[PDB]
Structure formats: structure tokens, C-alpha cells
Design a protein around this ligand. Structure first.
Ligand code: ZN
Ligand code: ZN
Ligand code: ZN
Lengths: 70, 4
């Protein structure tokens, strides 16, 4: 899986429709290849640290994987 | 998840 660790200043994305909780996040690559790009998404600027949740079924009510990692 |  992705597993990407966020860097300082990096955009991170959650989906208000599908995230199990507010800490559930995707890196830009996964977000842009996910169903969530068509949903009510939210972007935050990373302070660094933390990681992409692509592929975690516990993190997403729908569409846990992006097209690249599925 | 976001940094914890
Ligand atoms: Zn990712
Ligand atoms: Zn992915
Ligand atoms: Zn979604």
C-alpha cells in the first residue's frame, strides 16, 4: 500500500462523506485517483508526520483504495 | 492518519 508519510506543507485530503473520523486522510496521489474526488472533500495543509490511509477499510466507509493501490 |  501507499503508506506515504506527509511532509511539511503537503496537501492532505479527507472525505466528509466517507471518512470514519476526522483523522482519516489521503495523500494527493491517492485522493486524485479515488472516488472521493467527486465527494464533499476537505483539504488541510500538513504540518508534517502522519500518513496516508489509502487501503484502510477501517478508515473509509466506502472506497478505501485508490485506482493505483487497489 | 493525521500526525498523532
Ligand atoms: Zn497515498
Ligand atoms: Zn492509494
Ligand atoms: Zn468519499
Amino acid at each position: 500500500l501507499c503508506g506515504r508519510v506527509f511532509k511539511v506543507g503537503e496537501p492532505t485530503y479527507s472525505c466528509r462523506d466517507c471518512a470514519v473520523d476526522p483523522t482519516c486522510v489521503l495523500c494527493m496521489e491517492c485522493f486524485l485517483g479515488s472516488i472521493h474526488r467527486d465527494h464533499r472533500y476537505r483539504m488541510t495543509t500538513s504540518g508534517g508526520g502522519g500518513f496516508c490511509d489509502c487501503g484502510d477499510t477501517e478508515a473509509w466507509k466506502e472506497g478505501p483504495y485508490c485506482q493505483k493501490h487497489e | 492518519r493525521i500526525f498523532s
